[PDB]
């Protein structure tokens, strides 16, 4: 995250850190005790699918404070329509091997109904994006969880104000090079507040971090609600990676 602030410990309790061989891979969002939403592209180069770990309740990567909960990733589910190394349909649903325990420091973000998200949430101007990604373009990653308030653009406006955005994406942020999500943040939440509760509206995708004349690109979670809900009702299948039909 470029140009944000430290998320005070416990204030982003849905944030997930994904590790592979102990190394930072991506972020994610907890939506239930066993389900995490992340970005498909995070998994483009995974060799050993068995070595993927999700950590909840993380804050400061330099220390252990006892609020962290680590789980093995049992399933990584990716839409059929996602093509590795691209941006469209950049979403993954991860099943944890064992539920996390909800605590003051570990709480799911609400996955909204599609109608609500489209009719109401899509019109809330500002939303929060968070992660342990790069603090600067071509810079070091963060040791403490960072958060940033970004405004959402209608796609027409995005295109105009920009110095390929599909219906499965949206733009948010700033064009002045001061504030953005960055490498290391992908998969993390774009969270939207409405009447006292927070909801998942986007996933940090990719494409150029805090580049002048460009906005951040996020996966438009509303397009995937039904897809996600169906999968969460399904039994696990052997083998970690599952490609599931979309729609």
């Amino acid at each position: 995250i470029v140009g944000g602030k430290v998320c005070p410990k416990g204030e982003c309790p849905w944030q997930v850190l994904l590790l592979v061989n102990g190394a930072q891979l991506c972020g994610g969002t907890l939506i239930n005790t066993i389900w995490v939403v992340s970005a498909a592209h995070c998994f483009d180069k995974i060799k050993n699918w068995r070595n993927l770990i999700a950590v909840l309740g993380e804050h400061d990567l330099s220390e252990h404070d006892g609020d962290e909960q680590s789980r093995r990733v049992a399933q990584v589910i990716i839409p059929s329509t996602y093509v590795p190394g691209t941006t469209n349909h950049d979403i993954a649903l991860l099943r944890l091997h064992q539920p996390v325990v909800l605590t003051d420091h570990v709480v799911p973000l609400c996955l909204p109904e599609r109608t609500f998200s489209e009719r109401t949430l899509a019109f809330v101007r500002f939303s929060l994006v968070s992660g342990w990604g790069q603090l600067l373009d071509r810079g070091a990653t963060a040791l403490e969880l960072m958060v940033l308030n970004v405004p959402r653009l209608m796609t027409q406006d995005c295109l105009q104000q920009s110095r390929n955005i599909t219906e499965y994406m949206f733009c948010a942020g700033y064009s002045d090079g001061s504030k953005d999500s960055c490498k290391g943040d992908s998969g993390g939440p774009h969270a939207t507040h409405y009447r006292g509760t927070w909801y998942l509206t986007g996933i940090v995708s990719w494409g150029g971090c805090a580049t002048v004349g460009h906005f951040g690109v996020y996966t438009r979670v509303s397009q995937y609600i039904e897809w996600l809900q169906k999968l969460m009702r399904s039994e696990p299948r052997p083998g970690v990676l599952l490609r599931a039909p979309f729609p």
Binding site: E11, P13, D104, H105, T115
Partner: protein, 56 residues
């Protein structure tokens, strides 16, 4: 009251029905109050609330 406008007055989710009818609903871990619009937690750690802030 239509769901498309002002969320139908619902705190959370809204469904249109046949006629001048609307029903609000709440996410799991919440229940709907008698006002027919408000949602109140039913569990300790409802989704989308921040415990340290809810406590202060």
């Amino acid at each position: 009251l239509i769901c498309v406008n002002e969320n139908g007055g619902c705190e959370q989710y809204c469904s249109d029905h046949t006629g001048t009818k609307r029903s609000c609903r709440c996410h799991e871990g919440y229940s709907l109050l008698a006002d027919g619009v408000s949602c109140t937690p039913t569990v300790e750690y409802p989704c989308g609330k921040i415990p340290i802030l809810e406590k202060r």
